[PDB]
Design a protein around this ligand. Structure first.
Ligand SMILES: OCCC/C(=C(\c1ccc(O)cc1)c1ccc(C2CCN(C3CC3)CC2)cc1)c1ccccc1
Length: 222
């Protein structure tokens, strides 16, 4: 598959959390570590997205729209995938892994348990790298931004990625004629826990103890 193949190649290189053992552990250390990690990943996502066929020919405003609705889905799906071969831990990066006890120390228990629900589902499906990268692309195209101007063009991007996934499954998973549909039926859980995650920003902001960038605060309030 042309599209699956280029997506495999466009997969970004590992990113490291670079946590510092001289800062005493705390919910604040954990959360600001996750913020720096995520902003470096967001920068990688923009370069990555220009390898999605059709994405870079949308208007500036449409590209912003799609990415504004999908970035947390893309981030979480990466964490999900990196944890497939672990048990009840979330692999944020090779050097930043969270078990149940550290989730609680960070205030992220309920959120991380929701994510581990996704890990569990994809584990039993034996999710392949090929499927993960096409799912990531589909999460972007299917973001359901309310702002899109060129609805016809985004519908076409979803169809091209949808077609790539189905084609891949038709060839590599003939023992399951409905595997592509099973993959797509995990997307509602993905969007569910991105909304849970974005909503958590507001808890953190209200409590006021963890420092946030002033641009982020402005975005949150708006
Ligand atoms: O438990 C799972 C959720 C972890 C997590 C993550 C996270 C997810 C995946 C990943 O790979 C790395 C990190 C997170 C944290 C900070 C941001 C920032 C805010 C600041 N940025 C603006 C400056 C531009 C925008 C991004 C983005 C994501 C999170 C999310 C909400 C509350 C608390 C923790």
């Amino acid at each position: 598959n042309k599209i699956v193949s280029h997506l495999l190649v466009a997969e970004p290189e590992k990113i490291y959390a670079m946590p510092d053992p001289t800062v005493p552990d705390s919910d604040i250390k954990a959360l600001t570590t996750l913020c720096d990690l995520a902003d470096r990943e967001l920068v990688v996502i923009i370069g990555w997205a220009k390898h999605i066929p059709g994405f870079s020919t949308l208007s500036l405003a449409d590209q912003m729209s799609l990415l504004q609705s999908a970035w947390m889905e893309i981030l979480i799906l990466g964490v999900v995938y990196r944890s497939l071969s672990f048990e009840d831990e979330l692999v944020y990066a090779d050097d930043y892994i969270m078990d149940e006890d550290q989730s609680k120390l960070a205030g992220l228990l309920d959120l991380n348990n929701a994510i581990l629900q996704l890990v569990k589902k994809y584990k039993s499906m034996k999710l392949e790298k090929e499927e993960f990268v096409t799912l990531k692309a589909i999460a972007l195209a299917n973001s359901d931004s309310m702002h899109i101007e060129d609805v016809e063009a985004v519908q076409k991007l979803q169809d091209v990625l949808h077609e790539a996934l189905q084609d891949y499954e038709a060839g590599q998973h003939m023992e399951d004629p409905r595997r592509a549909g099973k993959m797509l039926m995990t997307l509602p859980l993905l969007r569910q826990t991105s909304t849970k995650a974005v909503q958590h920003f507001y808890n953190i902001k209200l409590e006021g103890k963890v420092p946030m960038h002033k641009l982020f605060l402005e975005m949150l309030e708006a």
